[PDB]
PDB file of C-alpha atoms and ligand atoms in Angstrom:
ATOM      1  CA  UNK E   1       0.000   0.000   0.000  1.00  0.00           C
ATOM      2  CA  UNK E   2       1.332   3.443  -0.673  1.00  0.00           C
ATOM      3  CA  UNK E   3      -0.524   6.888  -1.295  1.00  0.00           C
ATOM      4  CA  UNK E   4      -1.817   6.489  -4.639  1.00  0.00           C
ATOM      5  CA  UNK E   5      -3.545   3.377  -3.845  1.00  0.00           C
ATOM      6  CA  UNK E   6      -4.980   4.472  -0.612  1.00  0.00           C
ATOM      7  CA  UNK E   7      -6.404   7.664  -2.631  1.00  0.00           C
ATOM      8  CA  UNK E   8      -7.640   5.493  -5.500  1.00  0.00           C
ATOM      9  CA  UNK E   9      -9.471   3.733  -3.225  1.00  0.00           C
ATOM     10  CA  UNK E  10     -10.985   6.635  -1.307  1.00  0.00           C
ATOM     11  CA  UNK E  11     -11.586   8.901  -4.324  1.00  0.00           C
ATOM     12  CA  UNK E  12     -12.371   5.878  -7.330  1.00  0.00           C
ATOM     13  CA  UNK E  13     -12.182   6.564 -10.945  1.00  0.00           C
ATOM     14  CA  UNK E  14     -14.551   8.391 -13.265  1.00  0.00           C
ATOM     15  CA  UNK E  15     -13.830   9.102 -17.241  1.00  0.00           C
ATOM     16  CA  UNK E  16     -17.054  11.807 -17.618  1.00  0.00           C
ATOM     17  CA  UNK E  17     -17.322  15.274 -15.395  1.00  0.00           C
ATOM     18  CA  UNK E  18     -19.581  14.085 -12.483  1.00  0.00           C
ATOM     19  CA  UNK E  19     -20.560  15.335  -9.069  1.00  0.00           C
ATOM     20  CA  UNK E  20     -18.733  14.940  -6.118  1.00  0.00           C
ATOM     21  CA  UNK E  21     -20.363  14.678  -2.492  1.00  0.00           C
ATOM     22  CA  UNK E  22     -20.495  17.999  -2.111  1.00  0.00           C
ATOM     23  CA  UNK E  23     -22.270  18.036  -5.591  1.00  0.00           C
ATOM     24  CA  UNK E  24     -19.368  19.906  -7.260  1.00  0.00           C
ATOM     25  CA  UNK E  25     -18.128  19.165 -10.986  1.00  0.00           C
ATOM     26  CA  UNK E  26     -14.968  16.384 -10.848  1.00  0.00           C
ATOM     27  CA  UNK E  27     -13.469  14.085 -13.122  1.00  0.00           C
ATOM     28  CA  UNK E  28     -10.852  10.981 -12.573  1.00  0.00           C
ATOM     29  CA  UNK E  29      -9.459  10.395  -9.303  1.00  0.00           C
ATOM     30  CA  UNK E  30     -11.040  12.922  -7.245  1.00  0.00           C
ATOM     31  CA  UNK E  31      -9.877  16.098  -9.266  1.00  0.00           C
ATOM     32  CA  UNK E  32     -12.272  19.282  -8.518  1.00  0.00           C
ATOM     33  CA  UNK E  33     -12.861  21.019 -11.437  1.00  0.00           C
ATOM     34  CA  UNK E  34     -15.030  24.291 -10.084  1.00  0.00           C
ATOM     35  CA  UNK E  35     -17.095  25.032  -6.994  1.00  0.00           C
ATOM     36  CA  UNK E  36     -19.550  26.969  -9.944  1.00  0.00           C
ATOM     37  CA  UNK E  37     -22.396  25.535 -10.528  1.00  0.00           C
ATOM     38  CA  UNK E  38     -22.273  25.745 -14.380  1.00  0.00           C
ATOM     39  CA  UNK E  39     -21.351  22.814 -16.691  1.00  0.00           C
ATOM     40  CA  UNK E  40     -19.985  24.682 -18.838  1.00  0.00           C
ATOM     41  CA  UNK E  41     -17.637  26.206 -16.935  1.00  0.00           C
ATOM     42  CA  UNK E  42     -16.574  23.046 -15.630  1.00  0.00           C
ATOM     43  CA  UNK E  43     -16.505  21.755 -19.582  1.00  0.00           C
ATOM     44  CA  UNK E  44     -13.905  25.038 -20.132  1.00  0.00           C
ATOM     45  CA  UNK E  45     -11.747  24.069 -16.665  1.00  0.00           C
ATOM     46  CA  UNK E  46     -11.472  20.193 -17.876  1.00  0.00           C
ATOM     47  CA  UNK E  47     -10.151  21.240 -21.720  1.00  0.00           C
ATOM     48  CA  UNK E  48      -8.020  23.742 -19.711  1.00  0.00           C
ATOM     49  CA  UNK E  49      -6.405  21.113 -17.932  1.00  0.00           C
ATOM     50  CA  UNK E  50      -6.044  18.531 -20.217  1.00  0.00           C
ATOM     51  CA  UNK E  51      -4.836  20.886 -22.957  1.00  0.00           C
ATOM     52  CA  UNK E  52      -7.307  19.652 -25.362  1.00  0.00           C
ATOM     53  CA  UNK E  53     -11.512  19.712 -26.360  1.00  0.00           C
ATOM     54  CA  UNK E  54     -12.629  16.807 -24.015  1.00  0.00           C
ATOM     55  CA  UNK E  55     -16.166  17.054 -24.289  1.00  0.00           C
ATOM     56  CA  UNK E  56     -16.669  16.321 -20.430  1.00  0.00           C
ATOM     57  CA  UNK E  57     -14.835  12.769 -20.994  1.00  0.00           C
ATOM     58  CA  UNK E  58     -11.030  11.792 -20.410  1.00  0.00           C
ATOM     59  CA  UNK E  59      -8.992   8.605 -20.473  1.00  0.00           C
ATOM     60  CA  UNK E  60      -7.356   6.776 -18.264  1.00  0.00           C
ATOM     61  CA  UNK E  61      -3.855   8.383 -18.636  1.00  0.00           C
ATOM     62  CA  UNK E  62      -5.025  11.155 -18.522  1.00  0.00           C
ATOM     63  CA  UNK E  63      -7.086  10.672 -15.651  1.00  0.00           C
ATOM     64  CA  UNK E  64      -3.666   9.151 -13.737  1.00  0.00           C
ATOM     65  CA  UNK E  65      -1.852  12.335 -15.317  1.00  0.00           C
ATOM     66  CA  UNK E  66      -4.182  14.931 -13.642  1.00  0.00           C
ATOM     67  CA  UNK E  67      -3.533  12.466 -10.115  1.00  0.00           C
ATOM     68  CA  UNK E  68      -0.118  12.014 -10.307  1.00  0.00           C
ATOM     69  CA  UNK E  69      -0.411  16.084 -10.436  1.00  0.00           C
ATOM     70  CA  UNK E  70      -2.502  16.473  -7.552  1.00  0.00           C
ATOM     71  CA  UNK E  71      -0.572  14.050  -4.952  1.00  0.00           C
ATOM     72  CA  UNK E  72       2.737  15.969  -5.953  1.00  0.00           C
ATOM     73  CA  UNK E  73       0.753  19.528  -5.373  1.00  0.00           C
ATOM     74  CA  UNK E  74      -0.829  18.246  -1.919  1.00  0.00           C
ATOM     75  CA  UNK E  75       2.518  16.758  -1.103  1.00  0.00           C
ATOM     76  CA  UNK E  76       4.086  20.060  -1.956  1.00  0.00           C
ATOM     77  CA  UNK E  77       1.519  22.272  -0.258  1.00  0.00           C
ATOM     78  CA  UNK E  78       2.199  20.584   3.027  1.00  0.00           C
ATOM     79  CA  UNK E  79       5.799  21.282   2.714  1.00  0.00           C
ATOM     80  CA  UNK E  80       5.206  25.276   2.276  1.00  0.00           C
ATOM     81  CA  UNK E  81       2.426  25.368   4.570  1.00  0.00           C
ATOM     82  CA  UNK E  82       3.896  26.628   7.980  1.00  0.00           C
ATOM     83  CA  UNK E  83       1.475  24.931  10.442  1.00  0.00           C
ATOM     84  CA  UNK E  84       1.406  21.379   8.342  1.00  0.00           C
ATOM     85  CA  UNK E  85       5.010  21.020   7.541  1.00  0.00           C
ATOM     86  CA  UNK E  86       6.130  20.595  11.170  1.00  0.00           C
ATOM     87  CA  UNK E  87       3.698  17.864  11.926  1.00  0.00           C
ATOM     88  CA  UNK E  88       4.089  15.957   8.372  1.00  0.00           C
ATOM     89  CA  UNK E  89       7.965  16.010   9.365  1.00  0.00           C
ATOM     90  CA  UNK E  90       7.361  14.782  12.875  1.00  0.00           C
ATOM     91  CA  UNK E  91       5.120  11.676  11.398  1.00  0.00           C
ATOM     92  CA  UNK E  92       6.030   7.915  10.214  1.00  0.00           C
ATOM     93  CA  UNK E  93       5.693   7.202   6.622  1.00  0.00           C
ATOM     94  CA  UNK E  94       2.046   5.678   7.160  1.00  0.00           C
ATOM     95  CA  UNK E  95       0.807   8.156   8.515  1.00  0.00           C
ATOM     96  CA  UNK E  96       2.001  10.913   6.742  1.00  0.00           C
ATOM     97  CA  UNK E  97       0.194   9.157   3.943  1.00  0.00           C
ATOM     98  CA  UNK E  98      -3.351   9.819   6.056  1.00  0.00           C
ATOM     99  CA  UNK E  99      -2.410  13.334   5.994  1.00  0.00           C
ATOM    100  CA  UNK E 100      -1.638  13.397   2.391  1.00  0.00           C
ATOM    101  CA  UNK E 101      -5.007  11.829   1.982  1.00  0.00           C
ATOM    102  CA  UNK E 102      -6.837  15.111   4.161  1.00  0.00           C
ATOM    103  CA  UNK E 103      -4.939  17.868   2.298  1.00  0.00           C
ATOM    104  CA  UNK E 104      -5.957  16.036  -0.885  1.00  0.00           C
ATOM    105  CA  UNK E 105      -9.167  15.603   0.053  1.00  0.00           C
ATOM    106  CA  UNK E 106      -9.839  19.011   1.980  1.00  0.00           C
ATOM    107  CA  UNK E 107      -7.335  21.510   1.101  1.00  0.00           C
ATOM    108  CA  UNK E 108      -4.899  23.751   3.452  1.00  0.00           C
ATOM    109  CA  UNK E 109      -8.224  25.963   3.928  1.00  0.00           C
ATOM    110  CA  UNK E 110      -9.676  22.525   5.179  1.00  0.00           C
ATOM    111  CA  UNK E 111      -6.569  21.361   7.003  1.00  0.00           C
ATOM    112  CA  UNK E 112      -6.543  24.781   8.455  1.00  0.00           C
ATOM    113  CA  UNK E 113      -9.533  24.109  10.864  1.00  0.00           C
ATOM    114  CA  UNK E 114      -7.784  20.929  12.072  1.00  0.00           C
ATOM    115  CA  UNK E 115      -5.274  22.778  14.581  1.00  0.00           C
ATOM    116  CA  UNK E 116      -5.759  21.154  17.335  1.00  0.00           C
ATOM    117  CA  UNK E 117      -5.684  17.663  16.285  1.00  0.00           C
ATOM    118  CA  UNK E 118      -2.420  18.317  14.083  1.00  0.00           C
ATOM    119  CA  UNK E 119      -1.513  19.438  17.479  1.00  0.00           C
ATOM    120  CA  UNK E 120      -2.042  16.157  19.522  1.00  0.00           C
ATOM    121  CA  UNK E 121      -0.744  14.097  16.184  1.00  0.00           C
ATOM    122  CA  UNK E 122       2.339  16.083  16.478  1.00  0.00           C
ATOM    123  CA  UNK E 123       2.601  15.139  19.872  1.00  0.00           C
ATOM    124  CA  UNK E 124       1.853  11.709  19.221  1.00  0.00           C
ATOM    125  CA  UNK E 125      -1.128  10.929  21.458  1.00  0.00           C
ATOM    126  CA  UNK E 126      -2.892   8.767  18.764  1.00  0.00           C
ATOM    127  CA  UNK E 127      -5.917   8.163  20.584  1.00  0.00           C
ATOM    128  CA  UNK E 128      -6.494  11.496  21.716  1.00  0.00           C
ATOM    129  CA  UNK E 129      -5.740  12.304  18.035  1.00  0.00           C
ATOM    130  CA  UNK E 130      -8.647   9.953  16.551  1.00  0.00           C
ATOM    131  CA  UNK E 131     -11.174  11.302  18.846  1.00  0.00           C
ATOM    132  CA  UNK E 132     -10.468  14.907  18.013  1.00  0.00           C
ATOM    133  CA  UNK E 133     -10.649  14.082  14.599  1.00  0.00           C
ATOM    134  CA  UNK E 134     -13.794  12.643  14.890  1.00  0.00           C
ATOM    135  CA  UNK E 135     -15.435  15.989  16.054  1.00  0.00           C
ATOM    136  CA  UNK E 136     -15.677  17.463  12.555  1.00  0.00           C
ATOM    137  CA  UNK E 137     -18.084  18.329   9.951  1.00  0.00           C
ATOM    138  CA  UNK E 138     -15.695  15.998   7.904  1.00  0.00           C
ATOM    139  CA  UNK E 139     -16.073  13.169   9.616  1.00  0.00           C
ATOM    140  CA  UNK E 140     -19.946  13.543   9.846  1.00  0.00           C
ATOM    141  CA  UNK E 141     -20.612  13.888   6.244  1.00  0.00           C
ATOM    142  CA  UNK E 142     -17.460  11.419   4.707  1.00  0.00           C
ATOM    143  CA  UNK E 143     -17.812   8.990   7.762  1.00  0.00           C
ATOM    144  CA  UNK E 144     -16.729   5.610   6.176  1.00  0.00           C
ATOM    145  CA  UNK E 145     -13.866   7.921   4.525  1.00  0.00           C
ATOM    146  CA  UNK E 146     -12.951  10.107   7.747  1.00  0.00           C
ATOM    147  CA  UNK E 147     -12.508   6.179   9.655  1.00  0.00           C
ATOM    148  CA  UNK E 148     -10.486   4.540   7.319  1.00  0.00           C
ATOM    149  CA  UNK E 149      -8.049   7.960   7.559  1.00  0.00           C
ATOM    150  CA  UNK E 150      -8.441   8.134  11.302  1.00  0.00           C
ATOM    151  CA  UNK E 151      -7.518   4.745  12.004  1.00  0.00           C
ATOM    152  CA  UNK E 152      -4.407   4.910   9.672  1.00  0.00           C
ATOM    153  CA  UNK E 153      -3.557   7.884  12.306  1.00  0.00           C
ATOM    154  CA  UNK E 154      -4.206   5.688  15.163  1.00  0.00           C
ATOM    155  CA  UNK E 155      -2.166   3.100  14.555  1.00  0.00           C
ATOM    156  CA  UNK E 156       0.369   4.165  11.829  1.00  0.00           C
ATOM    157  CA  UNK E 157      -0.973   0.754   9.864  1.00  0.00           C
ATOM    158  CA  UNK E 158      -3.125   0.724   6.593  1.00  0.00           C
ATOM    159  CA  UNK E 159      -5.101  -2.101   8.399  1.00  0.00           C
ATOM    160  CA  UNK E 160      -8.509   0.004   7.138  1.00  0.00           C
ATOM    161  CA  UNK E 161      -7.281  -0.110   3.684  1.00  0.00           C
ATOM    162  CA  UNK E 162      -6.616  -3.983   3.760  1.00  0.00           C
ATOM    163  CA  UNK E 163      -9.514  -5.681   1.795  1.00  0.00           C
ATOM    164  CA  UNK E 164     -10.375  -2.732  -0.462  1.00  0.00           C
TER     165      UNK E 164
HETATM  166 CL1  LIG J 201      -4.857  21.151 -13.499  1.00  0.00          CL
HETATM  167 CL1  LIG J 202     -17.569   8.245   3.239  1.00  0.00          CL
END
């Protein structure tokens, strides 16, 4: 298990622009197009991506193209952002993969409201840490999600991704 397969598994795979669970426009492996509500717009951000007329639909490599971007941006937002980079440093490589999987998923502007649990992770109080986490709008609207991530922070295993 490494971080591409844990987000493939979290985020699946879909060739035509559909609606994530916050009901905005994505394609591939979890890859937000726009928070606008217009198709169209999200028709115009896909072909800007890609670098070609899609017509909503991709393929596969270029579905893994847009994802290999996004896990080296996330990656590389952690390391510039001044309140994540000390805890990703402090971490093992498991779970630095679970907070990988948040940024990805969330966002620094997500991450951002996670302070005091990057706190207690940093300090290494897992099960402090997994409660915490738990008290989140994130983990009441992703809940299957937000406990297969939390558990990977409580016990620095992928034992939640095992059977997937
Ligand atoms: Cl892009
Ligand atoms: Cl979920």
């Amino acid at each position: 298990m490494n971080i591409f397969e844990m987000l493939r598994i979290d985020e699946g795979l879909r060739l035509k622009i559909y609606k994530d669970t916050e009901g905005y426009y994505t394609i591939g492996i979890g890859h937000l197009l726009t928070k606008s509500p217009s198709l169209n717009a999200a028709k115009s951000e896909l072909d800007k991506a890609i670098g070609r007329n899609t017509n909503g639909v991709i393929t596969k490599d270029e579905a893994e193209k847009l994802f290999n971007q996004d896990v080296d941006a996330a990656v590389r937002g952690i390391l510039r952002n001044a309140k994540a980079k000390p805890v990703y440093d402090s971490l093992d490589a498991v779970r630095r993969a679970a907070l990988i999987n948040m940024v990805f998923q969330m966002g620094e502007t997500g991450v951002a409201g996670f302070t005091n649990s990057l706190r207690m992770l940093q300090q290494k109080r897992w099960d402090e840490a997994a409660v915490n986490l738990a008290k989140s709008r994130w983990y009441n609207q992703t809940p299957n999600r937000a406990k297969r991530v939390i558990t990977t922070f409580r016990t620095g295993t992928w034992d939640a991704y095992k059977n997937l």
